[PDB]
Amino acid sequence: KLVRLPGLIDVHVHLREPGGTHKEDFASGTAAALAGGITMVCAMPNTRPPIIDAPALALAQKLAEAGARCDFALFLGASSENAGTLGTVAGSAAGLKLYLNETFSELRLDSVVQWMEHFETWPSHLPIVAHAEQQTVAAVLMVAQLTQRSVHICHVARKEEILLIKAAKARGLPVTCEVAPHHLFLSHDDLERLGPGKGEVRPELGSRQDVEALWENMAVIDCFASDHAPHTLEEKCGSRPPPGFPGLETMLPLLLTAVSEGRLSLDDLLQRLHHNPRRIFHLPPQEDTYVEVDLEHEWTIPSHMPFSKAHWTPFEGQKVKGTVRRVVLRGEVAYIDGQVLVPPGYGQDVRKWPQGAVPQLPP
Amino acid sequence: KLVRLPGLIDVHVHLREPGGTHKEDFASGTAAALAGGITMVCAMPNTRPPIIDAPALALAQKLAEAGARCDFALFLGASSENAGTLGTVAGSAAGLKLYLNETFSELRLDSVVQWMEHFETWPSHLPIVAHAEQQTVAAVLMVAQLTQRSVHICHVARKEEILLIKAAKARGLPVTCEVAPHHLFLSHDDLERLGPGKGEVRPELGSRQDVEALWENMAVIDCFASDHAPHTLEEKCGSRPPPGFPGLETMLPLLLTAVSEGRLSLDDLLQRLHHNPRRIFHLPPQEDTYVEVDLEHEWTIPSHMPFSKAHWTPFEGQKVKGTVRRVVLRGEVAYIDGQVLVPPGYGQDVRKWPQGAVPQLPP
Numbered sequence: 001k002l003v004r005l006p007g008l009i010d011v012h013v014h015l016r017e018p019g020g021t022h023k024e025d026f027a028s029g030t031a032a033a034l035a036g037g038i039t040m041v042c043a044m045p046n047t048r049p050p051i052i053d054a055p056a057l058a059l060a061q062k063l064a065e066a067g068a069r070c071d072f073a074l075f076l077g078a079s080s081e082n083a084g085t086l087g088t089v090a091g092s093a094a095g096l097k098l099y100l101n102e103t104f105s106e107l108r109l110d111s112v113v114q115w116m117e118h119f120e121t122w123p124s125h126l127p128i129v130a131h132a133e134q135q136t137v138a139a140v141l142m143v144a145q146l147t148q149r150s151v152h153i154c155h156v157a158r159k160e161e162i163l164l165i166k167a168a169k170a171r172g173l174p175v176t177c178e179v180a181p182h183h184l185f186l187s188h189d190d191l192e193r194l195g196p197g198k199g200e201v202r203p204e205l206g207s208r209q210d211v212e213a214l215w216e217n218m219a220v221i222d223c224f225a226s227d228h229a230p231h232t233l234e235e236k237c238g239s240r241p242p243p244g245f246p247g248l249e250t251m252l253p254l255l256l257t258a259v260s261e262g263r264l265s266l267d268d269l270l271q272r273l274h275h276n277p278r279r280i281f282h283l284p285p286q287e288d289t290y291v292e293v294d295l296e297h298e299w300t301i302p303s304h305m306p307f308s309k310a311h312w313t314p315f316e317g318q319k320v321k322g323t324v325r326r327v328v329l330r331g332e333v334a335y336i337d338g339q340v341l342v343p344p345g346y347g348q349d350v351r352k353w354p355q356g357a358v359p360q361l362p363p
Numbered sequence: 364k365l366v367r368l369p370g371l372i373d374v375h376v377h378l379r380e381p382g383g384t385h386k387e388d389f390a391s392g393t394a395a396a397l398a399g400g401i402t403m404v405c406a407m408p409n410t411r412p413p414i415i416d417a418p419a420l421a422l423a424q425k426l427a428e429a430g431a432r433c434d435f436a437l438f439l440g441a442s443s444e445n446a447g448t449l450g451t452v453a454g455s456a457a458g459l460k461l462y463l464n465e466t467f468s469e470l471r472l473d474s475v476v477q478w479m480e481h482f483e484t485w486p487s488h489l490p491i492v493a494h495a496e497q498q499t500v501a502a503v504l505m506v507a508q509l510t511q512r513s514v515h516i517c518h519v520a521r522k523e524e525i526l527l528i529k530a531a532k533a534r535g536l537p538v539t540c541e542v543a544p545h546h547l548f549l550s551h552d553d554l555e556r557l558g559p560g561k562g563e564v565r566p567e568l569g570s571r572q573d574v575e576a577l578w579e580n581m582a583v584i585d586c587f588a589s590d591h592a593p594h595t596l597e598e599k600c601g602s603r604p605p606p607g608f609p610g611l612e613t614m615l616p617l618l619l620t621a622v623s624e625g626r627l628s629l630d631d632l633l634q635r636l637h638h639n640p641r642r643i644f645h646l647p648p649q650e651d652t653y654v655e656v657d658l659e660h661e662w663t664i665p666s667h668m669p670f671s672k673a674h675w676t677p678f679e680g681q682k683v684k685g686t687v688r689r690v691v692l693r694g695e696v697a698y699i700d701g702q703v704l705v706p707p708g709y710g711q712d713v714r715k716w717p718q719g720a721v722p723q724l725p726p
């Protein structure tokens with residue numbers, strides 16, 4: 001017996017196009033998404049060129065429309081020059097992304113005052129998400145309060161961070177957050193196996209106590225999102241390993257295994273991969289869209305999953321229970337048992353759908 | 364004609380006793396204070412051993428009572444073990460000091476949750492001050508709001524920081540701050556002259572734009588405080604230079620020069636070296652205490668000032684106008700024209716005076 005799930009949403013993926021297409025592109029990354037039971041993705045802006053102005057967004061929209069196999073929305077990225085310049089295109093994006101820790105020069109913000117300027121100028125009804133680690137979580141929460149609006153914290157990875165967010169929620173502050181599978185299923189204990197290159201990710205892998213704390217505070221976690229961050233094995237194993245793990249094809253099987261073990265319920269999972277992403281990012285429903293999974297099938301994660309161009313996975317060797325058998329997207333069979341059956345270009349920009357615009361008060 | 368000033372207060376000094384007495388001790392540091400027109404100092408807890416428990420505070424109190432030539436209060440320091448343990452001695456301290464950036468292991472806090480624990484456990488009516496740079500200012504402000512209390516930010520050194528504090532004040536948040544003379548009178552432009560060892564300080568010297576921003580936002584600055592942080596020249600010029608400048612003997616002459624140039628008023632100076640320190644730290648008046656200064660005398664800062672054991676100064680070569688001529692402390696001549704005339708042990712712990720206890724609601 002298969003279980004029918006709604007179309008799942010991953011609000012944090014790096015699809016590398018334009019400019020890093022040896023690592024992934026829209027066509028390969030969305031194939032990976034479909035194989036992982038994901039029917040809608042939100043793509044991050046740290047491409048080359050980065051999506052930090054209207055022309056770069058226009059290019060990205062066309063590349064995505066031509067290459068995506070599932071539906072999508074594209075983030076804009078905050079820079080040190082673009083506050084106050086994104087108003088005309090803001091509503092067409094998934095949201096605004098702030099890189100508040102390590103990143104490349106084009107997306108670096110040198111001062112908290114620049115964070116404030118973005119919070120003040122970005123339209124108040126549209127999402128803002130932040131890469132914010134450790135004390136940076138508290139700092140960006142302060143900026144959000146000074147500017148009287150909400151913020152969403154990406155990939156919470158530490159006991160310190162989830163407890164801070166928990167305290168903020170207890171005070172009624174408008175903050176939401178997401179957690180990535182590697183911060184729930186890997187830890188320092190895995191670094192010996194992974195090695196120093198493969199093991200590089202930001203936020204870094206946590207201690208057993210960090211992992212435990214995330215599970216214990218599941219009530220505080222609004223969304224799961226992969227932070228799919230593909231790089232090739234050559235890059236990961238080289239002299240300057242870039243941070244990041246591929247994760248679209250492994251996320252749902254890992255979480256289904258946890259459901260099967262009673263670590264969280266099926267509903268807990270669907271709140272975090274469907275309902276909460278929809279409501280935080282104002283993402284529209286997908287008509288005639290669903291995922292069929294087999295919860296009984298036991299398998300071992302191989303050295304690489306079929307679709308991502310990363311061609312490696314840090315979860316190699318983990319035993320899982322649960323598999324995606326079929327995906328239907330807008331009334332077409334998109335995936336069955338290892339075969340993707342919708343072409344590049346089948347996917348659409350959900351922000352262009354009437355039901356995908358974020359509601360706002362008139363001027 | 365001399366101008367009579369009230370007894371000035373420096374709320375941020377490192378007097379190095381116990382454990383670093385080759386750099387300074389209570390007797391030498393308070394001699395330096397008196398020579399700088401300061402009659403009351405608040406001493407930081409990063410001594411060896413650090414002042415992080417009741418026994419260390421008891422030792423420090425006796426060393427200060429025996430060695431101090433001016434009056435004083437002693438900070439307690441926050442550690443990763445002492446939250447919830449300082450209640451019985453808290454009221455006897457100047458306040459609680461949090462080192463939120465670089466420091467030695469005993470005072471290191473590894474998580475924002477530890478900051479929260481201190482804000483929750485330290486008595487709500489007593490001062491908390493923080494070494495908090497750049498985004499750490501925003502982070503500690505968030506913790507203060509979550510716990511519904513005030514915080515004082517030490518040595519604000521950057522445009523970024525003073526503008527964040529300005530924004531917080533505009534929102535009615537209970538935050539105050541201090542600025543050190545080196546962040547008003549030195550900048551990157553001075554690093555060539557100082558060299559990489561002498562130039563080491565935390566917070567680091569700022570750009571011309573940082574310095575300009577502090578002056579332009581003088582209204583945001585509640586206090587001046589030296590961050591007197593003495594180290595010997597051997598240490599500063601060695602292979603592992605410790606951060607810090609001596610500053611007690613140079614602070615007032617630098618600021619008097621600025622007053623003479625119309626950069627701030629005499630009142631602006633006295634708010635920041637007398638009234639605001641009193642009211643933020645609940646420090647008592649000193650009876651029969653005053654400082655006489657000569658505002659006309661032009662001199663050049665030498666390679667070392669007479670009293671601090673640091674025996675060097677980063678202000679060497681600067682031209683100043685204004686000199687301390689006489690200090691009277693509690694009815695005794697304490698300093699005249701280069702001679703200290705009160706012995707070690709003349710100074711008293713102001714928190715033991717009836718008028719020096721911080722008022723609180725009964726239990």
Ligand SMILES: O=C(O)c1[nH]c(=O)[nH]c(=O)c1F
Binds near residue numbers: 014
């Ligand atoms: O794009 C990436 O590879 C990347 N990888 C990471 O591990 N963290 C990031 O914040 C990121 F932007």
Ligand SMILES: O=C(O)c1[nH]c(=O)[nH]c(=O)c1F
Binds near residue numbers: 566593605606
């Ligand atoms: O004690 C010191 O020397 C010291 N020196 C600095 O330059 N900054 C500090 O925060 C500090 F504690």
Ligand SMILES: [Zn+2]
Binds near residue numbers: 131154202203
């Ligand atoms: Zn990130």
Ligand SMILES: [Zn+2]
Binds near residue numbers: 012154
């Ligand atoms: Zn995210």
Ligand SMILES: [Zn+2]
Binds near residue numbers: 014044227229
């Ligand atoms: Zn990411």
Ligand SMILES: [Zn+2]
Binds near residue numbers: 517
């Ligand atoms: Zn400091």
Ligand SMILES: [Zn+2]
Binds near residue numbers: 374375516518541588
């Ligand atoms: Zn201070």
Ligand SMILES: [Zn+2]
Binds near residue numbers: 377
């Ligand atoms: Zn200090």
